[PDB]
């Protein structure tokens, strides 16, 4: 790999610089190189990995939705034929998105997840695995759509089971996992009632645990709780 000759510490430093420069593709490449050194990632390093690829895939998802909407309009009744171009370019972006998702899943599988034994690392990586299968699910249309969906569900569910046994209900990783699994339920699995139930139960059990927290942990938890509330407000 292109980063094989750079020190692990230098890759991490440059990932932090790229974040400051809003150079997320660079940030992602540096963190991939850091992961490929074979050592486990600290809490900070895991979050740099996640932030980098979330930003990269985020721009691709936003582009794909723009193009998918144009494509759908061009296939409506009374729409003037424009040729293969819209479909071709949507497919190009889609393929790049799928490549990024495959790259992240590849790092999780080789070998981040199998070496992660603490709840805070294992839940984090399994959440990410569910997230990147979910992004694949968003653009899936063929005969593997169901298996992609079930791969996301499976990863989320294992993370939920560990988080419920090993983490307090206000733990921000646990909270962010439940947020994302609830969105999975709502718009990927077509289970809006499960989504609403998960988000309500998650919010209420966090509320009842806030009294145990410091001022700074309180801020971290209530930030994600507000995201659960925002969704519940749209859903009910």
């Amino acid at each position: 790999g292109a980063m094989g000759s750079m020190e692990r510490a230098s890759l991490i430093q440059k990932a932090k610089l790229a974040e400051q420069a809003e150079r997320y593709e660079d940030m992602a490449a540096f963190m991939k190189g850091a992961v490929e050194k074979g050592e486990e990632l600290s809490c900070e390093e895991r979050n740099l990995l996640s932030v980098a690829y979330k930003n990269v895939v985020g721009g691709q998802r936003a582009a794909w939705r723009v193009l998918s909407s144009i494509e759908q309009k061009s296939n409506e009744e009374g729409s003037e034929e424009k040729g293969p171009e819209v479909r071709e370019y949507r497919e190009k972006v889609e393929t790049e998105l799928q490549g990024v998702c495959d790259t992240v899943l590849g790092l999780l599988d080789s070998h981040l997840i199998k070496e992660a034994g603490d709840a805070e690392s294992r839940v984090f990586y399994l959440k990410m695995k569910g997230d990147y299968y979910r992004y694949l699910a968003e653009v899936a249309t063929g005969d593997d759509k169901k298996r992609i969906i079930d791969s996301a569900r499976s990863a989320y569910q294992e993370a939920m089971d560990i988080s419920k046994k090993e983490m307090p209900p206000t733990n921000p990783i646990r909270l962010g996992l439940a947020l994302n699994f609830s969105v999975f339920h709502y718009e990927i699995a077509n289970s809006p009632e499960e989504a609403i139930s998960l988000a309500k139960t998650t919010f209420d059990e966090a509320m009842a645990d806030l009294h145990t927290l410091s001022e700074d942990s309180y801020k971290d938890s209530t930030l994600i709780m507000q995201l659960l509330r925002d969704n519940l407000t749209l859903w009910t």
Partner: peptide, 12 residues
């Protein structure tokens, strides 16, 4: 279309 809240950067 309408995107619901998920964790971390809303970069999309």
């Amino acid at each position: 279309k309408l995107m619901f809240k998920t964790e971390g950067p809303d970069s999309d």
